[PDB]
Amino acid sequence: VRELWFPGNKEVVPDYLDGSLVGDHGFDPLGLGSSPEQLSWNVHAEIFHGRLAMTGVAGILLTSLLHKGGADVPEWFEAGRVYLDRNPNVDFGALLFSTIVMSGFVEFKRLNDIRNPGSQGSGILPEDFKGVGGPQGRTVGGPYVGGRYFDPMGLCRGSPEQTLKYKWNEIRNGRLAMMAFLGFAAQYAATGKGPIDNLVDHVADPFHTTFVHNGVSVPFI
Amino acid sequence: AGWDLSAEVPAHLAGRKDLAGNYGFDPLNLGKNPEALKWYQQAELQNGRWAMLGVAGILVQELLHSTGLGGKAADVYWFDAGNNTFWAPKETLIAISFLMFNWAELNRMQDYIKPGSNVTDPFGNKIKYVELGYPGFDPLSFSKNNFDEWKLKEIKNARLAMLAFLGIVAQHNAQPGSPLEQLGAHLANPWKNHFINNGVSPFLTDN
Amino acid sequence: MKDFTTYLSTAPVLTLLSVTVVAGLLIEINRFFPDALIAAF
Amino acid sequence: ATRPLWQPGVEAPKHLDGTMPGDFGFDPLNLGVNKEALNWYRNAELQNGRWAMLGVAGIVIPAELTRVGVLNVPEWAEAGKVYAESENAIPFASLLMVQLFLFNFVEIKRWEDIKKPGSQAEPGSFLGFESGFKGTGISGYPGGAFNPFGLGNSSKEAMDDLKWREIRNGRLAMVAFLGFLSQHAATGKGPLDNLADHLADPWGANFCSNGVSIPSALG
Amino acid sequence: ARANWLPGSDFPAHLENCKLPGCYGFDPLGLGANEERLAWFAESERVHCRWAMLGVAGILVQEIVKPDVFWYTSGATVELPFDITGLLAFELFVMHWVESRRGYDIKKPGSMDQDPIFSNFKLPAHEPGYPGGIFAPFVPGSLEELKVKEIKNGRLAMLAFIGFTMAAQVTGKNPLAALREHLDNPLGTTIFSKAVVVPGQAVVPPCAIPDTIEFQGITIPAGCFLHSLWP
Ligand code: CLA
Ligand code: CLA
Ligand code: CLA
Numbered sequence: 011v012r013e014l015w016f017p018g019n020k021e022v023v024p025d026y027l028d029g030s031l032v033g034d035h036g037f038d039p040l041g042l043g044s045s046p047e048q049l050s051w052n053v054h055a056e057i058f059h060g061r062l063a064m065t066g067v068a069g070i071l072l073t074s075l076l077h078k079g080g081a082d083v084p085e086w087f088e089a090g091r092v093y094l095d096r097n098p099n100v101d102f103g104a105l106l107f108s109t110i111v112m113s114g115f116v117e118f119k120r121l122n123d124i125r126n127p128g129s130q131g132s133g134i135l136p137e138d139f140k141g142v143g144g145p146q147g148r149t150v151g152g153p154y155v156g157g158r159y160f161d162p163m164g165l166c167r168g169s170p171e172q173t174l175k176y177k178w179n180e181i182r183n184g185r186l187a188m189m190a191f192l193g194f195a196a197q198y199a200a201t202g203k204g205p206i207d208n209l210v211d212h213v214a215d216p217f218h219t220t221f222v223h224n225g226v227s228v229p230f231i
Numbered sequence: 232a233g234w235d236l237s238a239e240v241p242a243h244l245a246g247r248k249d250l251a252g253n254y255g256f257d258p259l260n261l262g263k264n265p266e267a268l269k270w271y272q273q274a275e276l277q278n279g280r281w282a283m284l285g286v287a288g289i290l291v292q293e294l295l296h297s298t299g300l301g302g303k304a305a306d307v308y309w310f311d312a313g314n315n316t317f318w319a320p321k322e323t324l325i326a327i328s329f330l331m332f333n334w335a336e337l338n339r340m341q342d343y344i345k346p347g348s349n350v351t352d353p354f355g356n357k358i359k360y361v362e363l364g365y366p367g368f369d370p371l372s373f374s375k376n377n378f379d380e381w382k383l384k385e386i387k388n389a390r391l392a393m394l395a396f397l398g399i400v401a402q403h404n405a406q407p408g409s410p411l412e413q414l415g416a417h418l419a420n421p422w423k424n425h426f427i428n429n430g431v432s433p434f435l436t437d438n
Numbered sequence: 439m440k441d442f443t444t445y446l447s448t449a450p451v452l453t454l455l456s457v458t459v460v461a462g463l464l465i466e467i468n469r470f471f472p473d474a475l476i477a478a479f
Numbered sequence: 480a481t482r483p484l485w486q487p488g489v490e491a492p493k494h495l496d497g498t499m500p501g502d503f504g505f506d507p508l509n510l511g512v513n514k515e516a517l518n519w520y521r522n523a524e525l526q527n528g529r530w531a532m533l534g535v536a537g538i539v540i541p542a543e544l545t546r547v548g549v550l551n552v553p554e555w556a557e558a559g560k561v562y563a564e565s566e567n568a569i570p571f572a573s574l575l576m577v578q579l580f581l582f583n584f585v586e587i588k589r590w591e592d593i594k595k596p597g598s599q600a601e602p603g604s605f606l607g608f609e610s611g612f613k614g615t616g617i618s619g620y621p622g623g624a625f626n627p628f629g630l631g632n633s634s635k636e637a638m639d640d641l642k643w644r645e646i647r648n649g650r651l652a653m654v655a656f657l658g659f660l661s662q663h664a665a666t667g668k669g670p671l672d673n674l675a676d677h678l679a680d681p682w683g684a685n686f687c688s689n690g691v692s693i694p695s696a697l698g
Numbered sequence: 699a700r701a702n703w704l705p706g707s708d709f710p711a712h713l714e715n716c717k718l719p720g721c722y723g724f725d726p727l728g729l730g731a732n733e734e735r736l737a738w739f740a741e742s743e744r745v746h747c748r749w750a751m752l753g754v755a756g757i758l759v760q761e762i763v764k765p766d767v768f769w770y771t772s773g774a775t776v777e778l779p780f781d782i783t784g785l786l787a788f789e790l791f792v793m794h795w796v797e798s799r800r801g802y803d804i805k806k807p808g809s810m811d812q813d814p815i816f817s818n819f820k821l822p823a824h825e826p827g828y829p830g831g832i833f834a835p836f837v838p839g840s841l842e843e844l845k846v847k848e849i850k851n852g853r854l855a856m857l858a859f860i861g862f863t864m865a866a867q868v869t870g871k872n873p874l875a876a877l878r879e880h881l882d883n884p885l886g887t888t889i890f891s892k893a894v895v896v897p898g899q900a901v902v903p904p905c906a907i908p909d910t911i912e913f914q915g916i917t918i919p920a921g922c923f924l925h926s927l928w929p
């Protein structure tokens with residue numbers, strides 16, 4: 011049918027990972043989303059992780075490019091202490107609690123959308139926050155939210171194949187950015203420098219600058 | 232719709248044409264409840280009339296302060312009006328104000344809860360009554376012709392004067408001097424002297 | 439994972455995880471608030 | 480059933496229909512599953528909200544008047560000791576006992592009204608004053624001698640609007656008094672002092688800097 | 699076939715038989731797939747065209763009459779006859795008025811063609827985004843090809859303004875000064891000449907506009923758009 015995560019091989023999990031979800035290639039060897047409710051929850055988690063990692067990786071890349079350009083911009087792994095030193099009037103608990111509260115408001119909005127896909131498009135929010143559905147066949151709520159506010163340019167209203175192409179773009183870029191953030195953390199742990207620093211160090215010297223030469227991955231060379 | 236083109240009147244301001252200055256302006260919909268709207272219309276009339284009286288007093292007394300007509304009574308700032316000795320001290324003036332305004336405002340509220348029930352005095356004399364907040368206190372009679380236009384003029388002046396007194400208190404708590412002095416100091420340049428160049432209004436500038 | 443979560447909901451797994459989290463909570467309470475002989479407010 | 484709720488997305492519990500004033504469907508602990516217990520909790524909410532409104536008024540209006548140079552009222556937390564040092568001060572135990580005796584007399588009558596709503600209105604109770612305790616059929620809303628101005632007794636929905644205003648104001652003042660207690664317990668300053676300090680530097684002056692909320696042992 | 703942004707290719711879906719002027723089958727990302735979004739983007743394109751035309755013409759004429767002044771820093775060093783805060787407030791008020799009127803026309807056409815002052819004066823019924831009447835006194839021929847001329851000049855002027863600000867950021871001088879710098883040395887004044895990245899070294903032209911400029915006591919972080927990503 012579709013291109014699988016391991017070509018050939020027809021033991022791909024039973025027909026809950028059929029070729030319907032965006033990004034579906036039959037990759038669930040551990041069965042972590044076997045039940046349909048867990049599958050929907052994990053689709054929400056995957057889309058959210060992809061979008062969050064995409065935002066985070068874009069921010070990390072831009073702050074690392076600005077750091078190499080001489081700007082007064084810290085690296086991603088030390089921006090918290092740099093912000094606290096530059097701004098001593100801010101309490102750490104203050105900023106943390108404010109982040110918790112504001113993030114919690116929108117996350118409870120998303121949570122009550124997960125519980126009831128149609129319950130967030132009324133009340134204080136307008137009908138644009140109803141959602142458009144997609145996963146598991148429903149046409150309301152879910153990770154994909156239409157409207158003129160979360161799709162203000164309207165690039166998935168009209169032309170359904172354009173919507174499918176853009177959804178595939180989003181899921182592939184999100185998975186790539188999740189692996190990118192994993193690589194960022196591993197490179198910071200094994201080298202102690204930024205991502206762009208590692209990239210230009212490897213581009214300047216292709217050899218003797220691989221992962222085996224940092225002394226952390228291979229722990230004796 | 233009148234207050235904002237390409238906007239729709241909030242339903243309960245559409246069918247009731249008999250409101251002075253009904254321009255459809257109720258975006259927060261305070262008076263959707265008809266009794267709440269009646270209360271807010273009475274509050275309109277009261278606040279507007281007291282604000283017209285107050286702003287006229289401020290402007291006239293500050294004009295007499297800037298030009299010079301009255302003696303030491305009129306040669307004080309409006310916010311420093313209590314420095315004069317006058318004829319009575321503070322306490323008895325406030326007390327008699329409480330008493331007679333209790334009398335008049337309870338007459339007005341008794342009219343409010345039952346329109347036309349309180350128009351007769353113990354002396355036996357009687358007056359005509361119309362509408363609710365318009366008790367026919369018209370001696371020289373300008374109400375016999377186009378009363379809607381006169382009411383519209385009154386409500387426009389009332390809204391202008393409520394805005395005026397809000398401006399008076401905001402200017403006084405922002406910039407020193409009389410409001411006429413503030414208008415003149417504005418008119419001095421006027422490209423620099425305005426509400427941004429205060430250091431007490433925008434807060435983003437000048438800390 | 440319905441059967442796996444049902445196994446996790448079985449009485450021994452739940453009681454071991456519950457005594458584990460309760461013991462860990464008490465241990466970290468004594469780690470941050472040691473030698474609390476009385477409830478002095 | 481379509482009224483706004485405490486969580487747009489979470490349906491109201493089946494014991495909170497919408498009739499009670501201020502029913503936003505908020506009962507995650509399900510404390511009011513019993514109807515008679517629900518009525519008792521409604522009366523307790525009314526009493527706590529009214530006493531908190533009176534207390535928060537008597538805290539924040541004298542403190543504000545002291546801030547602007549009127550009357551000069553001391554801090555609410557130390558106002559008990561300020562009076563107790565007077566030359567003609569009633570002793571604490573005697574004053575408490577007098578207050579408790581009067582409140583015993585009043586609120587045993589209120590309690591008997593809570594049980595049967597037409598309790599105290601029977602003839603021959605007082606000395607002609609029993610007519611003022613008829614009640615409005617709902618306990619906690621007596622009327623009669625109470626409510627002299629007769630606000631809301633005109634259209635029924637006018638009284639329901641005032642009931643919702645009362646319950647929201649009572650809840651706000653209860654939260655406010657809890658805030659006053661917790662703010663003075665942590666910081667030895669008044670509520671207006673805490674507010675003024677927060678506007679000086681909100682990122683620096685808050686509950687994460689008093690040293691009492693977040694324990695110092697963790698950090 | 700017809701005029702196309704890429705000859706031999708076809709139009710997409712939303713652009714089949716365009717009614718908007720200057721339609722050449724573009725939109726690779728499909729931004730105008732939606733209906734009302736296409737009209738909103740058409741209005742934003744028209745006002746962008748006209749504003750960038752005004753900007754490029756203003757920069758050019760300001761340089762012809764005053765070659766010694768630098769347009770990028772002209773907002774800070776021009777010696778205003780009036781104070782700037784009141785001037786900015788006046789602009790904010792009047793432009794809020796006129797842009798609110800234009801935007802609500804785009805929301806609904808038959809809603810505000812009327813003078814709020816005089817009842818007799820009122821714009822005639824017109825297609826959205828093209829007022830006319832008092833706004834269009836003199837028309838050299840038919841309206842359609844002149845609309846195409848207007849929109850094409852507007853695209854050219856938006857590209858011109860982006861080239862203007864990039865010449866100002868890279869060379870530190872005027873775009874006609876940058877022109878006369880390019881003509882006498884065509885092989886050397888190109889960005890390919892002064893900016894090459896190779897896997898091992900990146901050559902970036904230095905920024906000329908100062909990062910921080912002082913203006914009436916305050917400082918404005920008017921650096922150079924953003925560095926780092928410069929080729
Ligand atoms: C936490 C992020 C996240 C989440 C929630 C999901 C969730 C999902 N993925 Mg996805 N995926 C991700 C990241 C994620 N993915 C990344 C980064 C890649 C690129 C490598 C992919 C590539 C991928 C493919 C190709 C496919 C899926 C598919 C699926 C769906 C079915 C699989 C499943 O049910 O297992 C649930 C998954 C989890 C519960 C998260 C696993 C986390 C484990 C428990 C931790 C260990 C993993 C970690 C990498 C080890 C290192 C950790 C630490 C030592 C640093 C499901 C909704 C299949 C699908 O049908 O698409 C709809 C499918 O075809 N994913
Ligand atoms: C700058 C502080 C200040 C404030 C807040 C007040 C406030 C007040 N003064 Mg006073 N006064 C002041 C300074 C001040 N004064 C000074 C500096 C002097 C001279 C030295 C005087 C001399 C003076 C005199 C002689 C008299 C007053 C009187 C009054 C009362 C007006 C009567 C009324 O409101 O009707 C009655 C009020 C009600 C029926 C309802 C209570 C009010 C509630 C809250 C509703 C009102 C809404 C509220 C005003 C709007 C919100 C606030 C708004 C400004 C944003 C009023 C409460 C008059 C008075 O005592 O009453 C007759 C009076 O005669 N003042
Ligand atoms: C912000 C200015 C702007 C806006 C709002 C529009 C809007 C529109 N253009 Mg247009 N265009 C512009 C600038 C603009 N254009 C410029 C400067 C050029 C010259 C290169 C062109 C050349 C052009 C052609 C040839 C055609 C259009 C067409 C259209 C219409 C359909 C395309 C569409 O639906 O996507 C809407 C477009 C946007 C919403 C703009 C989004 C801007 C993104 C978010 C920023 C990215 C900038 C990008 C990387 C370039 C950097 C700028 C600079 C370095 C060059 C549409 C109403 C087609 C048409 O049918 O005509 C009516 C068509 O044939 N345009």
Ligand SMILES: CC1=C[C@H](O)CC(C)(C)[C@H]1/C=C/C(C)=C/C=C/C(C)=C/C=C/C=C(C)/C=C/C=C(C)/C=C/C1=C(C)C[C@H](O)CC1(C)C
Nearest residue numbers: 257258259260278281282285288289309312393394396397
């Ligand atoms: C409509 C609406 C609806 C929607 O929905 C929403 C919203 C928006 C909210 C709205 C709006 C509102 C508003 C604006 C309001 C305002 C009001 C006012 C201002 C009042 C005043 C009001 C005001 C007033 C009364 C005033 C008065 C005054 C007076 C008496 C004065 C007096 C005096 C004098 C003479 C002199 C001396 O020496 C001093 C004194 C003593 C000082």
Ligand SMILES: CC1=C[C@H](O)CC(C)(C)[C@H]1/C=C/C(C)=C/C=C/C(C)=C/C=C/C=C(C)/C=C/C=C(C)/C=C/C1=C(C)C[C@H](O)CC1(C)C
Nearest residue numbers: 506507508509527530531534537538555558653654656657
């Ligand atoms: C709803 C629910 C249900 C679900 O299911 C569950 C849960 C969650 C549990 C819940 C919640 C709850 C809550 C929130 C509670 C709270 C309460 C309060 C706070 C009260 C207070 C309450 C409060 C109160 C009464 C108060 C009162 C006060 C007073 C009188 C005061 C007095 C005073 C004054 C004037 C001043 C002076 O100098 C002092 C004194 C003498 C001190």
Ligand SMILES: CC1=C[C@H](O)CC(C)(C)[C@H]1/C=C/C(C)=C/C=C/C(C)=C/C=C/C=C(C)/C=C/C=C(C)/C=C/C1=C(C)C[C@H](O)CC1(C)C
Nearest residue numbers: 725726727728729746749750752753756757769772856859
């Ligand atoms: C089409 C499409 C579709 C697809 O699908 C996607 C894509 C591709 C993305 C797209 C797009 C593309 C593009 C190219 C865009 C662009 C635009 C622009 C450039 C705008 C500007 C625009 C521009 C503009 C307005 C400008 C303006 C300017 C101005 C006013 C100036 C002014 C001035 C002057 C006079 C001088 C003085 O001393 C100063 C100043 C103040 C400086």
